[PDB]
Every structure is written in structure tokens, then in C-alpha cells.
């Protein structure tokens, strides 16, 4: 489930999320650059010439960072976010799942590959790999008993309890980005208050037509749906769905 | 404590940005606990703080201050001028960030009149890098239509 | 121009390749690029930040009233029976 300690530390160092200032973004580049190679032409240099910035200053720090302690000829993703002050933030990301599958082909393989692609390296546990391995195997397909009957339920129980623990331990930033039906603790409140992006995520959650407001709106719509088509007041959505599926 | 009577008629202007030159400091105390109770108020206060950070000033980051109150009744905005007078713009439902900006700027013009009447000298408004950044979007809109 | 080209001093910054490689890059080096050095960091600067004068406000209100009366007059201009039936059947197909 979790990669080696040295590999995880190395990944945390290379794929970092610097504190974003929160200014009005101009655009987002998703480029593919190798470690030992400096891109200054059509893929990156042309965009930096269109924008007016110097690609050399970016290539210097990129070659200073990704070149050492890296395997040669490894395609790496770079997400660059440009703000209205003509300033850019670039973040490195591991190779795409397509490149990983290509290198693997020249479930064990799929899980070992998906071990390398979490959503945030600050917490390699969340999200659970077994959910994204589904998309990994789906992309692979797009490209081209007595032990099982107990391991299925063992893994089901482990997945369920880990999902519950994640729902309980969701931090303040994740709470503001996506609502949560578990009580909030003062410890997590202080942990989220220490983070600087708290103000940015707060403004984005306060602005309407956001994902947070959409989740709140669909919660309210489900409440109204229960209040309108419920056999009784204290009706749970699970039993309501059972009624729907058994009454058609 | 003034040597002259105060002004009578105020200039009419749709104040879209803040001007922290005649303003000593601002403390915006906001509550980040829950927002389903103040979606309008929290958004208004946060965008007002954002505009105050992006306001017209040499270094507005040194004059603007934000305070998270884990247990607060309603977000407050305290403004202290060069004299030290404390003013509180009331925040109600339906009040927009532009509304708060206009309130604060009207009260700032009144306070600047009070300072000039008392005898305090004030740095006058002139062409600044913020004015150039504003003429940027002025050129943009004049080229649009 | 080749001598005093931009970033031409990088050959002289590092006195040795070993001394250059001794330095370790961090995410702070990436984060420092997002901060403008001369000007102060500001969140947003859009067209809504443009303050309006009294004449501009009166002109904008006049343009809004003109747009209102223009919509009202177009409600009768497009009310020519052909276009009116067109919009009516379009609304019927929308609601159906």
C-alpha cells in the first residue's frame, strides 16, 4: 500500500507544492519535460516568448533540481501556473500512467505502479490506491478460490475502516474544499489555521457556484426530496433508495 | 480641536478600491469556523480584505491585518486613522464588497477632512505605480470598446 | 551584445562545477519566482477596480436605462407574428 521510505522521502522532496500566493491566475501549462533535458523551444520556450518571460531562469532551476539523483530518460510532468503579476509557479509530477504502463509492458504490476501516483505527497495514505488502480487498469485496457473468498472480505473491511478513518481525520483544508459529516476538532482547526492557504480556500468556498456550494446545494436538494417523497420524517436515504429500487 | 469649520459637500465617486494613505491600519477579524451561516457575509468580508490587500498603497501588506477568531459573533472591521480614531463599518446581509469599500472610502474622506481641519498634514494623492497598473486595464477596456 | 547578453553571468556565477553541484535546490527556489520583487504583491487587478466619476456613473445609468427601453422595444419589434409564433413554439418545445 505504501512505497519504500527512501522512495517516499525522495518523492516528497521532488514533487512539492509551494505555498501559492493566491493571485488571479492567467493560465496553466501542463508540459512534459525530461530530467536531464532543458526545454527552451516550441513546447516551453515558445510559450515563455509569447508570455514575455525568460525561459532560461526556469530552465536553470529545473536542471538544478531534477537532474541529480534521477534516472535518465524519464518523462516528467510539470504544471506551471501563471498569475496576473507575470509570475509563474512550476511543480514537478511523476510520469503519466500511460508512460508507466508503456514501461511496464515494454494487478501486482498495476498496484506497484499506482504506488507512485498519489494526490498529495504530504499524506501518501490519502487517497487509497485501490480506488485509483481502477482508473489505472481502465487506461491500460483503453491502451490495449478458498483464499480469494476470504481475502475479498478482509480487503473490504480494511478499505471500509480506512475510508472511515480518513473521513474522520479529514483536515480543515479538505473540510473547506469538500464538506464532511464528522465533528470538527480544535486540533484540526489549529492545524488548518497554521496553513497560509486557509484564506484562499476560504474565499473559494465562500464564492458561490463553487464545488463546496454545489455539494451543499445537492445536500439541500436531497433533504427536500426526502421531505417531499418520504414515507416518514425520520427516513434515511439508504431506506429511501431501497424503497425506490423495490417499488419502481 | 479644529481651527476651521468642516467641509459640507462630499465628492461623488464610485469607490472601487481602497486608499490607505490617510489610514493608519485596518484589523479585519473574521471567523473561519462555519460558513453555511454567513455565506454572503463571509464572502463580502473576504473579498473586501482581498481588495484592501490589492488597494492603492506603497505597501498595503504593512497596514492590512487579518485575524482568525475561532469563536466570533460576526466579522468586524476596525479602521484606525493617523489621528487614531476608531470607526466600524456595519456589515449586514446584502452588503457587497464594493458597498463596504464605498463606506470605508467615504468615512476616510471625512476623516481626512477632519485631520486637515485640525491641522494635521496629509500626503496628497498623486500618480503612483498603482495608477499605472490601473491605466493598464483602462487601456484594455478602451481597446475593447 | 553576446558579451552583455541576458543571463550571460551564469558562466561566472559558479567558480567550479563541484561548488555548483554542492548546492541543493529546494521548493523555496520555485516559490520565490512567484513574488514580484519591485512592486508589492497584490491579489487581483481587474476592470471592476476602476473607480468611476460622477459623470461616468450618470452615463452608465443612462446607458442602462437605454438598454432597458431597448429590450422593451425589441419585445414589440420581434412581436411580428412570424417571429412571435417562432418564439412561442420554441418555448413550447423547451417546456415539453
Amino acid at each position: 500500500r505504501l512505497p519504500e521510505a527512501l522512495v517516499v522521502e525522495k518523492a516528497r522532496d521532488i514533487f512539492g507544492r509551494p505555498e501559492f500566493p493566491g493571485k488571479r491566475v492567467l493560465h496553466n501549462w501542463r508540459f512534459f519535460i525530461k530530467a536531464g533535458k532543458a526545454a527552451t523551444g516550441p513546447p516551453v520556450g515558445q510559450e515563455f516568448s509569447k508570455l514575455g518571460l525568460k525561459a532560461m531562469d526556469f530552465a536553470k532551476v529545473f536542471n538544478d533540481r531534477t537532474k541529480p539523483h534521477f534516472k535518465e530518460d524519464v518523462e516528467l510532468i510539470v504544471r506551471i501556473q501563471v498569475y496576473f503579476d507575470k509570475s509563474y509557479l512550476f511543480t514537478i509530477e511523476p510520469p503519466p500512467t500511460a508512460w508507466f504502463i508503456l514501461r511496464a509492458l515494454r494487478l501486482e504490476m498495476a498496484y506497484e505502479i499506482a504506488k507512485m501516483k498519489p494526490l498529495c505527497w504530504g499524506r501518501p495514505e490519502y487517497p487509497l490506491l485501490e480506488t485509483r488502480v481502477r482508473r489505472v487498469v481502465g487506461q491500460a485496457r483503453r491502451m490495449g478460490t478458498e483464499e480469494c473468498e476470504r481475502y475479498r472480505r478482509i480487503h473490504m473491511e480494511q478499505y471500509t475502516t480506512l475510508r472511515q478513518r480518513e473521513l474522520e481525520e479529514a483536515p480543515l483544508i479538505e473540510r473547506l474544499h469538500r464538506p464532511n459529516m464528522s465533528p470538527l476538532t480544535d486540533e484540526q482547526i489549529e492545524e488548518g489555521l497554521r496553513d497560509p492557504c486557509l484564506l484562499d480556500t476560504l474565499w473559494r468556498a465562500s464564492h458561490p457556484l463553487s464545488p463546496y456550494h454545489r455539494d451543499l446545494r445537492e445536500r439541500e436538494l436531497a433533504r427536500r426530496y426526502l421531505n417531499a417523497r418520504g414515507w416518514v420524517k425520520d427516513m434515511t436515504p439508504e431506506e429511501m433508495r431501497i424503497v425506490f429500487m423495490n417499488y419502481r | 480641536g479644529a481651527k476651521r469649520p468642516l467641509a459640507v459637500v462630499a465628492p461623488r465617486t464610485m469607490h472601487r478600491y481602497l486608499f490607505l494613505m490617510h489610514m493608519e491600519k485596518v484589523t479585519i477579524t473574521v471567523s473561519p469556523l462555519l460558513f453555511g451561516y454567513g455565506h454572503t457575509i463571509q464572502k463580502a468580508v473576504l473579498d473586501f480584505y482581498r481588495r484592501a490587500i490589492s488597494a492603492r498603497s506603497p505597501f498595503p501588506k504593512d497596514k492590512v491585518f487579518l485575524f482568525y477568531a475561532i469563536d466570533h459573533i460576526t466579522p468586524r472591521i476596525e479602521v484606525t486613522w493617523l489621528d487614531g480614531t476608531s470607526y466600524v463599518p456595519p456589515v449586514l446581509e446584502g452588503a457587497s464588497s464594493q458597498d463596504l469599500i464605498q463606506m470605508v472610502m467615504e468615512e476616510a474622506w471625512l476623516a481626512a477632512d477632519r485631520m486637515a481641519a485640525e491641522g494635521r498634514v496629509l500626503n496628497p494623492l498623486a500618480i503612483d505605480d498603482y495608477k499605472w497598473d490601473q491605466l493598464v486595464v483602462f487601456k484594455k477596456v478602451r481597446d475593447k470598446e | 551584445l553576446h558579451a552583455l547578453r541576458p543571463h550571460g553571468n551564469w558562466d561566472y556565477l559558479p567558480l567550479h562545477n563541484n561548488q555548483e553541484q554542492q548546492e541543493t535546490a529546494s521548493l523555496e527556489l520555485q516559490g520565490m519566482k512567484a513574488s514580484v520583487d519591485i512592486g508589492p504583491n497584490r491579489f487581483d487587478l481587474n476592470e471592476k477596480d476602476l473607480s468611476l466619476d460622477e459623470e461616468e456613473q450618470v452615463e452608465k445609468a443612462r446607458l442602462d436605462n437605454e438598454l432597458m427601453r431597448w429590450r422593451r422595444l425589441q419585445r414589440a419589434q420581434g412581436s411580428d407574428y412570424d417571429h412571435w409564433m417562432e418564439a412561442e413554439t420554441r418555448r413550447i418545445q423547451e417546456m415539453a
Partner: peptide, 22 residues
Amino acid sequence: QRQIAEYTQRTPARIPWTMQGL
């Protein structure tokens, strides 16, 4: 008798370093 028988503040926000350090 039966009932007794059953019975027995203001913290400043942290500006990101990319904005506060310059």
C-alpha cells in the same frame, strides 16, 4: 426517589511566505 435511584480568541492570519517575505 426512583429518579435518584436510577441516577446514582483573536489570532492573526499567516500570510504565505511568497507574499510576506518580499
